[PDB]
Amino acid sequence: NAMLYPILTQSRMLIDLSGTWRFKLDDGSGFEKKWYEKTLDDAQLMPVPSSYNDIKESADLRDHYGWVFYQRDLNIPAYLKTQRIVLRFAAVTHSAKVYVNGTLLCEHKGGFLPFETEIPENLIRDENLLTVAVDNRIDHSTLPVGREDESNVLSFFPYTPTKKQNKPNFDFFNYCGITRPVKLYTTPKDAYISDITLTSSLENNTARINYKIDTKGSAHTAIGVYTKQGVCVAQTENTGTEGSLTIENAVLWEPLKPYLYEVKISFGEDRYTLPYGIRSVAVKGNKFLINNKPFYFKGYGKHEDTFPAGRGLNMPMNAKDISLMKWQGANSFRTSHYPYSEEMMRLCDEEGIVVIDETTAVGVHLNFRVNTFDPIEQGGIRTQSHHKEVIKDLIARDKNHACVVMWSIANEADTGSKGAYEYFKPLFDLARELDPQKRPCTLVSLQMVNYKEDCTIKLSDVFCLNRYYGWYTCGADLQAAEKMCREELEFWNSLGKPFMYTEYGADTVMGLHDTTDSMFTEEYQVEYYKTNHKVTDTLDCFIGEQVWNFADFATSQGLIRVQGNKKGLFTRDRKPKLAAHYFKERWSKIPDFGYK
Amino acid sequence: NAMLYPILTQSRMLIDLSGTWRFKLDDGSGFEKKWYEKTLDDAQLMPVPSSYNDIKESADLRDHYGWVFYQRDLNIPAYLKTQRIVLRFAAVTHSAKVYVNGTLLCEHKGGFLPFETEIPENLIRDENLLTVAVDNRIDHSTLPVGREDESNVLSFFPYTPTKKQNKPNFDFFNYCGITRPVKLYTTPKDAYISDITLTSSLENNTARINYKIDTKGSAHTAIGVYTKQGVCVAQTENTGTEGSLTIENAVLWEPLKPYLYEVKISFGEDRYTLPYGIRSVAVKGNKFLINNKPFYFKGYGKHEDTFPAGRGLNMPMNAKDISLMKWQGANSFRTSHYPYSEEMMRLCDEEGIVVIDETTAVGVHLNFRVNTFDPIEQGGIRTQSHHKEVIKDLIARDKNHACVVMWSIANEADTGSKGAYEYFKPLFDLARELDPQKRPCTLVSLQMVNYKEDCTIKLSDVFCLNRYYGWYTCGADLQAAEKMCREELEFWNSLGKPFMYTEYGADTVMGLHDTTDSMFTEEYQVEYYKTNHKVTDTLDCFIGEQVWNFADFATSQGLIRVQGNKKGLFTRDRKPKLAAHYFKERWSKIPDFGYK
Ligand SMILES: O=C(O)c1cn(C2CC2)c2cc(N3C=CN([C@@H]4O[C@H](C(=O)O)[C@@H](O)[C@H](O)[C@H]4O)CC3)c(F)cc2c1=O
Ligand SMILES: O=C(O)c1cn(C2CC2)c2cc(N3C=CN([C@@H]4O[C@H](C(=O)O)[C@@H](O)[C@H](O)[C@H]4O)CC3)c(F)cc2c1=O
């Protein structure tokens, strides 16, 4: 469960296994014929990390259904065997089977969170083959959810598909493969650090770090806290597993003004250094408080999506995206609709970007007659069990990030229907139990005629609304959109708790224009946002605006998707639309703290 | 009924009243307050001819519901009163009331066909005001048909519109206004030509023109036929109303090789000259014969649509469009979905472009539970009576055009439902009765699950199909599209009569690309057409391909319309997409005659 980010330390090797791997589509016989026991024959080459769907020009590759096999050679020095040898997969989408030589080492379900496995030393021969089989199939038991009929979420006349294909119950393309880096790392065999938990206490004008260090084996523990320049500001040797350290002259991590201490931990020979921002988060009344100050979210729902790697880790684009958000005056984004790479989370900690951290739970809705949360034995959704593992794993991975201020339990589940509360109650209970910082929890609310029956009202600390007044309703009638927006949002405002837009927007094709309200035009995108803001700016409990979307991104094919989703403020190659300049202006006049 | 195109002759003045007119939106009180009796107060200026919707930047103007008032001064020489004075409206969309000074002169229904009225000389004062009130409203009794609920033909969540608006039952924007020129012309008072009918007889290797000259008053008739250089090749004086003339050395009008004789007619002092192409049209077996040769249609459904005039007469664009069709190797187009201007028809006669001439009958479908052709007293469609007047007027206007080879009675009516045959039988009977050339008649068939019950099979001389295999069905599954296309078209091919595509295409945004099948991309548009052609090229009764559409054009707003309809081979400003070059290549290898 514990998943420390792998780093090069005095006690820990870090070997990146990324590069060109061999790649072979499964044809139904791949496991029967035990392809993982030899070199892949008649194979292609595929970059790792990357989604595989867009690297070639093959529609059958892009739209492949089922398994693929990745493989590479792994010839490592024998003196590594004096250490504990670990294979870390930061993400394999959606499910993986990992083989070393002929031998199945592990299997994983869930395409967006890391997993790892020791390599037993009796298995390492002189030359080794690493094989990773990757399953892309989605159904009523996976997160994200796939449809199990021939229905498309986006048809006039019915037809029989040529081949079976995944049918996403979500509005983004089903990019799969070895999405994020594969690495080999080592620790001391006999005594090593397995996890680190840090929390902050700011009471009585005294900043303290509380630590809890999880180990394997028997040794002595030490912890030191260091400034960015390397001055030790607190340290203790031969400590317990738990304790606290006072940080005199503590500098707080603040949105757009990050400060990270370096927390170095020793256990026997093992050494691990964890960056850590000191800050508090709390919901009080109708305010979202960061370091006891009333925060206003300004930003976006995002996607991990770039050409040609798809969902694949793209670190230059990560840095470019954060630079664009600072240029635009944003302070935050949400990990729509899955955990993002640790490289992104760590960069956000470094750059002072606030993150709403979301699970993989999109598509938990069977009625976009069996109801979504009917009993499984009557056709209800089969995701609750995996939904708990995802929450456990997500919090275990990201718990120490200062940038994470809120957990989002699901995106647009069927939360107005019968049984939703009972499905979601244990998941909220679990997230509150597991997060040592006890951060606020929410689910992101689907737009819905019976919004007063949204079970978010009974569960969430912040109400997060996805609303499309002026796009999916009142299209090209913004005066009607304004009225419909005000009627519903005055209800939410009357509940006295913080609420916010986590999505709102309008599909906009760069280069289409009209001085007169016309859907898909750059001007309409601006007018859409002006209309919504006319309402939200008058509501004192509305504490944040995150647009849909930061940038255009790939989706499944359909009559309402113009080469993907076009609601980005930026294009897929990160060029500003008219509305992106509109937001730079607007967000320049709105402070991070004390707007409402 | 008779509607000779107005021309300047030795006996006929022609005064164009086009230019800047005064323009005022009605507010409900325009007739009550009798605005037509004075200058329009607090008015704008509007170009005539033009649609009014896009000239300004006002959404309320663009989306106006109801009446508008146009007005201009009309100060004419008194010596005109020695002649018969006629006001000709080439088109006023959709309905008009015409006033001179205070006096209602005529009212017209039908937005795409000419109407005229004598100006009684006792009404002409020294200074005169011409007022034209124009109604844009559409319903179950107009052609084209408007919906009478709040439904859009292209909604996720229901909303109340801010204002009432026209709801077209058709896929093009409801452009209205004084669409085509307004002209004053004169004839002799006492004896003048009211209509001319010409037909051709090619039997026995002898080309003859049969004439029938309709007059008012008592005088002597003469007719002469002249070559383009002005050589008289047949003539007779003091003739009857009907007769025939042999044309020795006759040159036939042929597709892409036009020849027009000039037919000059005298009656008393009146003189009228009519261009006339000699050619035959006939359907025999599975062949469409022009001048006894098996024709293959290559071209488009079009729209009259340019920026900013909308539906308005744009003669430079007409010439540009014909130049592009010759550049692409097309030979034909259909007047989708209304009669086009006489200026276009006459230019097509001059340039050798073959025309399928279509009525205004689009939207004759109430179920895109009351059935379309239920009795009117039970909610059935109320268009049949006006549908006959439109057919009468269209044939009366266009009967002498060599370029017109086929009448299209309706576009995508509900022809697979009960009662369609009975609705359409009298209209086909009427068109065959009225056309002196007895040209083939068709209706354009909607795509429909029960296509074997399409009443076109019982009525039409050529089966004209609108099909979207690979767009509205099988989208991004072209291999399935090919199979579905072949299954249905082998049925049509098995009937042994000529059939053809009058629409097929794929929405394509210029500048969107992908080497791998992706809807809305330029490459997908090409692949869509390749797939269809794989099938049609193997069917010996398939005698023509007209794409949807020649060029992108404006529509109502909705989630599936990217700033209008994007199925053009060209953009709205006439720039070629990838598929336009594809068709230039393809149509360069397909002959006008003897392809199948
Ligand atoms: O053809 C139509 O009529 C509609 C089609 N679709 C589907 C997307 C094809 C609708 C979807 C609705 N929901 C689906 C996604 N929710 C968020 O919206 C973003 C976006 O759609 O841009 C996604 O990208 C985000 O991931 C997701 O969180 C919005 C609400 C809806 F309310 C109405 C319609 C239609 O009306
Ligand atoms: O959102 C969807 O799912 C669909 C939406 N629409 C409507 C246009 C919004 C459909 C329409 C269908 N008909 C409507 C128009 N016919 C011709 O098509 C051209 C075009 O549509 O390009 C028009 O411009 C031409 O004038 C017209 O003759 C095609 C058949 C259909 F069969 C399926 C759908 C959908 O499935």
Short mmCIF file of C-alpha atoms in Angstrom, two decimals, chain A residues 291-550:
data_model
loop_
_atom_site.label_atom_id
_atom_site.label_comp_id
_atom_site.label_asym_id
_atom_site.label_seq_id
_atom_site.Cartn_x
_atom_site.Cartn_y
_atom_site.Cartn_z
CA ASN A 291 -3.58 28.99 6.42
CA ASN A 292 -6.66 30.52 8.10
CA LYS A 293 -7.46 32.72 5.10
CA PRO A 294 -10.55 32.65 2.85
CA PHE A 295 -9.47 31.12 -0.47
CA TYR A 296 -11.09 31.61 -3.90
CA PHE A 297 -10.32 28.86 -6.44
CA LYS A 298 -9.30 30.13 -9.89
CA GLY A 299 -8.48 27.50 -12.46
CA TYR A 300 -9.52 24.48 -14.45
CA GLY A 301 -10.41 20.92 -14.73
CA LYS A 302 -7.52 19.43 -16.71
CA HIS A 303 -6.68 16.21 -18.50
CA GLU A 304 -3.37 14.46 -18.92
CA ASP A 305 -3.49 14.72 -22.69
CA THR A 306 -0.83 15.71 -25.23
CA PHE A 307 0.01 14.67 -28.78
CA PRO A 308 1.26 12.05 -29.61
CA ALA A 309 1.76 10.35 -26.20
CA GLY A 310 -1.90 10.62 -25.23
CA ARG A 311 -2.15 10.14 -21.46
CA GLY A 312 1.62 9.59 -21.24
CA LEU A 313 3.90 11.51 -18.88
CA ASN A 314 5.12 14.62 -20.70
CA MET A 315 7.30 16.62 -18.35
CA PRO A 316 8.06 19.59 -20.66
CA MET A 317 4.29 20.06 -21.16
CA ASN A 318 3.74 19.82 -17.40
CA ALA A 319 6.11 22.71 -16.92
CA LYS A 320 4.57 24.62 -19.85
CA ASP A 321 1.08 24.08 -18.44
CA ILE A 322 2.02 25.46 -15.02
CA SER A 323 3.66 28.44 -16.69
CA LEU A 324 0.45 29.12 -18.63
CA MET A 325 -1.66 28.91 -15.48
CA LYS A 326 0.56 31.45 -13.74
CA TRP A 327 0.45 33.63 -16.85
CA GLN A 328 -3.35 33.44 -16.77
CA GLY A 329 -3.56 34.16 -13.01
CA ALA A 330 -4.98 30.77 -12.01
CA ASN A 331 -4.16 29.24 -8.64
CA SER A 332 -5.57 25.71 -8.85
CA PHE A 333 -6.81 22.75 -10.89
CA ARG A 334 -8.60 19.41 -10.40
CA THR A 335 -7.13 16.05 -11.52
CA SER A 336 -10.06 15.31 -13.85
CA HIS A 337 -10.85 12.39 -13.93
CA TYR A 338 -8.07 10.25 -12.44
CA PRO A 339 -4.92 10.66 -10.30
CA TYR A 340 -2.14 12.45 -12.19
CA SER A 341 1.52 11.49 -12.25
CA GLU A 342 3.62 12.00 -9.16
CA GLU A 343 5.87 14.20 -11.32
CA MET A 344 2.93 16.59 -11.76
CA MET A 345 1.97 16.48 -8.07
CA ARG A 346 5.57 17.16 -7.02
CA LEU A 347 5.91 20.03 -9.50
CA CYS A 348 2.67 21.54 -8.16
CA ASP A 349 4.11 21.41 -4.62
CA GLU A 350 7.18 23.21 -5.99
CA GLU A 351 5.22 25.85 -7.90
CA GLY A 352 2.44 26.61 -5.41
CA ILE A 353 -0.49 25.27 -7.47
CA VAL A 354 -3.47 24.06 -5.41
CA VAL A 355 -4.90 20.69 -6.45
CA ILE A 356 -8.29 19.03 -6.01
CA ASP A 357 -7.22 15.37 -6.11
CA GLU A 358 -9.77 13.09 -7.79
CA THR A 359 -10.21 9.32 -7.99
CA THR A 360 -10.79 7.32 -11.19
CA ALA A 361 -14.56 7.18 -10.46
CA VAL A 362 -16.16 8.55 -13.65
CA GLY A 363 -19.06 6.73 -15.38
CA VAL A 364 -20.66 5.50 -12.10
CA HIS A 365 -24.03 6.07 -13.80
CA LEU A 366 -26.18 3.54 -15.64
CA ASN A 367 -28.93 5.91 -16.77
CA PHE A 368 -27.20 8.83 -18.45
CA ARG A 369 -34.97 -0.36 -16.22
CA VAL A 370 -31.95 -0.97 -13.95
CA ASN A 371 -30.85 1.78 -11.55
CA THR A 372 -27.17 2.55 -11.03
CA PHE A 373 -27.15 1.60 -7.33
CA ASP A 374 -29.52 -1.34 -7.50
CA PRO A 375 -28.07 -4.48 -5.88
CA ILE A 376 -25.31 -6.05 -7.98
CA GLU A 377 -27.40 -9.22 -8.23
CA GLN A 378 -30.03 -7.13 -10.07
CA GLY A 379 -27.66 -5.36 -12.46
CA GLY A 380 -26.44 -2.48 -10.28
CA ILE A 381 -22.97 -1.01 -10.76
CA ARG A 382 -20.14 -3.29 -9.57
CA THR A 383 -17.51 -0.65 -8.71
CA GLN A 384 -17.83 -0.04 -4.96
CA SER A 385 -15.15 -2.54 -3.91
CA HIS A 386 -12.52 -1.23 -6.33
CA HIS A 387 -13.64 2.31 -5.50
CA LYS A 388 -12.42 1.73 -1.91
CA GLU A 389 -9.03 0.39 -3.05
CA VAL A 390 -8.59 3.43 -5.32
CA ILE A 391 -9.37 5.82 -2.45
CA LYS A 392 -6.94 3.94 -0.17
CA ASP A 393 -4.20 3.97 -2.77
CA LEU A 394 -4.73 7.59 -3.79
CA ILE A 395 -4.54 8.92 -0.25
CA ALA A 396 -1.55 6.69 0.54
CA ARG A 397 0.29 8.10 -2.51
CA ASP A 398 -0.57 11.78 -2.13
CA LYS A 399 -1.16 12.32 1.61
CA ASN A 400 2.00 14.39 2.16
CA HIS A 401 1.38 16.91 -0.64
CA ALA A 402 0.78 20.45 0.54
CA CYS A 403 -0.76 21.24 -2.85
CA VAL A 404 -3.60 18.77 -2.28
CA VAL A 405 -6.39 20.57 -0.38
CA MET A 406 -9.48 18.46 -1.15
CA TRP A 407 -10.36 14.91 -2.22
CA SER A 408 -12.94 14.38 -4.96
CA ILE A 409 -14.56 10.98 -4.50
CA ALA A 410 -16.26 10.68 -7.94
CA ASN A 411 -17.08 12.73 -11.04
CA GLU A 412 -20.74 12.88 -12.10
CA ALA A 413 -22.00 9.70 -10.48
CA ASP A 414 -25.77 9.09 -10.40
CA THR A 415 -26.01 10.94 -7.07
CA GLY A 416 -29.63 12.01 -7.42
CA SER A 417 -30.95 8.44 -7.62
CA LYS A 418 -31.96 5.92 -4.99
CA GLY A 419 -29.07 4.13 -3.33
CA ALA A 420 -26.39 6.73 -4.08
CA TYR A 421 -26.03 7.82 -0.44
CA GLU A 422 -25.52 4.22 0.69
CA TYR A 423 -22.95 3.63 -2.06
CA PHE A 424 -21.05 6.79 -1.14
CA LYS A 425 -21.29 6.89 2.68
CA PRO A 426 -18.55 4.22 3.23
CA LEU A 427 -16.27 5.94 0.69
CA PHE A 428 -16.48 9.32 2.42
CA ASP A 429 -16.03 7.61 5.78
CA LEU A 430 -12.95 5.86 4.37
CA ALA A 431 -11.32 9.01 2.98
CA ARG A 432 -11.82 10.85 6.28
CA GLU A 433 -10.42 7.90 8.22
CA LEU A 434 -7.34 7.53 6.02
CA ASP A 435 -6.22 11.10 5.40
CA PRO A 436 -3.97 12.07 8.33
CA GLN A 437 -4.69 15.71 7.50
CA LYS A 438 -8.48 15.19 7.47
CA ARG A 439 -8.87 17.38 4.37
CA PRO A 440 -12.34 18.25 3.01
CA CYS A 441 -14.05 15.67 0.81
CA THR A 442 -16.47 16.20 -2.04
CA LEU A 443 -17.96 14.56 -5.05
CA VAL A 444 -18.37 16.50 -8.27
CA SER A 445 -22.07 16.94 -9.03
CA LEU A 446 -23.64 16.11 -12.37
CA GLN A 447 -26.17 18.59 -13.75
CA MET A 448 -29.55 17.14 -12.95
CA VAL A 449 -33.20 18.18 -12.94
CA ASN A 450 -33.71 17.06 -9.31
CA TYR A 451 -30.61 18.80 -7.97
CA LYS A 452 -32.15 19.25 -4.53
CA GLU A 453 -31.94 15.45 -4.13
CA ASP A 454 -28.21 15.33 -4.93
CA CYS A 455 -26.74 13.25 -2.08
CA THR A 456 -23.68 15.52 -2.15
CA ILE A 457 -25.72 17.64 0.24
CA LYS A 458 -25.55 14.88 2.84
CA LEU A 459 -21.88 13.98 2.35
CA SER A 460 -19.61 16.71 1.02
CA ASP A 461 -17.68 19.48 2.78
CA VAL A 462 -17.68 21.60 -0.43
CA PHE A 463 -20.38 21.34 -3.10
CA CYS A 464 -18.64 21.08 -6.48
CA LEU A 465 -20.98 21.63 -9.44
CA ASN A 466 -20.59 20.77 -13.12
CA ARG A 467 -23.00 23.10 -14.92
CA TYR A 468 -23.43 24.04 -18.58
CA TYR A 469 -25.97 26.87 -18.60
CA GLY A 470 -25.61 28.18 -22.14
CA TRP A 471 -24.13 25.02 -23.70
CA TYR A 472 -26.06 21.77 -22.97
CA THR A 473 -29.08 23.85 -22.04
CA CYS A 474 -30.08 27.32 -23.22
CA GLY A 475 -27.60 27.00 -26.10
CA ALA A 476 -27.42 30.38 -27.92
CA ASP A 477 -29.98 31.82 -25.42
CA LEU A 478 -27.69 33.34 -22.81
CA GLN A 479 -30.41 35.53 -21.33
CA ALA A 480 -32.33 32.33 -20.50
CA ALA A 481 -29.08 30.72 -19.29
CA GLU A 482 -28.56 33.55 -16.80
CA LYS A 483 -32.04 33.12 -15.34
CA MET A 484 -31.77 29.33 -15.12
CA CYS A 485 -28.30 29.66 -13.57
CA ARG A 486 -29.48 32.11 -10.89
CA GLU A 487 -32.52 30.03 -9.92
CA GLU A 488 -30.50 26.89 -9.11
CA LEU A 489 -27.41 28.57 -7.68
CA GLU A 490 -29.52 30.59 -5.24
CA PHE A 491 -30.61 27.23 -3.82
CA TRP A 492 -27.01 26.13 -3.38
CA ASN A 493 -26.10 29.53 -1.96
CA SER A 494 -28.93 29.24 0.59
CA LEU A 495 -27.33 26.14 2.18
CA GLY A 496 -24.52 28.28 3.67
CA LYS A 497 -21.66 25.90 2.83
CA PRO A 498 -18.88 26.58 0.31
CA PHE A 499 -19.78 25.70 -3.26
CA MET A 500 -18.07 26.13 -6.59
CA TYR A 501 -17.96 25.36 -10.29
CA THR A 502 -15.69 22.46 -11.08
CA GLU A 503 -16.84 22.52 -14.74
CA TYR A 504 -18.45 25.08 -16.99
CA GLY A 505 -17.69 25.87 -20.62
CA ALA A 506 -18.56 25.87 -24.29
CA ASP A 507 -17.04 23.98 -27.23
CA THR A 508 -14.97 26.46 -29.17
CA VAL A 509 -13.12 25.85 -32.43
CA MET A 510 -10.10 28.14 -32.69
CA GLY A 511 -10.59 30.40 -35.70
CA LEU A 512 -14.41 30.40 -35.80
CA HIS A 513 -15.81 33.88 -35.11
CA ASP A 514 -19.04 35.91 -35.11
CA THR A 515 -19.87 39.26 -33.50
CA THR A 516 -23.39 37.82 -32.91
CA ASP A 517 -23.95 34.95 -30.42
CA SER A 518 -23.08 31.77 -32.36
CA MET A 519 -22.21 28.42 -30.70
CA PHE A 520 -18.64 27.10 -31.36
CA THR A 521 -17.35 30.67 -31.96
CA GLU A 522 -14.57 32.24 -29.89
CA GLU A 523 -16.85 35.14 -28.96
CA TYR A 524 -19.63 32.88 -27.71
CA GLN A 525 -17.17 31.19 -25.34
CA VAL A 526 -16.41 34.58 -23.78
CA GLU A 527 -20.10 35.57 -23.60
CA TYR A 528 -20.96 32.21 -22.02
CA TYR A 529 -18.48 32.90 -19.23
CA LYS A 530 -19.56 36.53 -18.77
CA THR A 531 -23.15 35.34 -18.30
CA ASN A 532 -22.27 32.75 -15.66
CA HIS A 533 -20.05 35.24 -13.82
CA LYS A 534 -22.91 37.76 -13.70
CA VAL A 535 -24.55 35.27 -11.35
CA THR A 536 -21.67 33.68 -9.43
CA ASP A 537 -20.13 37.06 -8.58
CA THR A 538 -23.28 37.90 -6.56
CA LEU A 539 -23.26 34.73 -4.37
CA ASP A 540 -21.27 34.94 -1.14
CA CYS A 541 -20.96 31.14 -0.66
CA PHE A 542 -19.57 30.60 -4.18
CA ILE A 543 -15.86 30.26 -3.47
CA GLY A 544 -14.33 29.11 -6.73
CA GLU A 545 -14.44 28.81 -10.50
CA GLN A 546 -12.68 26.03 -12.40
CA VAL A 547 -13.50 26.05 -16.09
CA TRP A 548 -14.01 23.05 -18.30
CA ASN A 549 -11.33 22.65 -19.68
CA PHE A 550 -7.73 23.88 -19.49
#
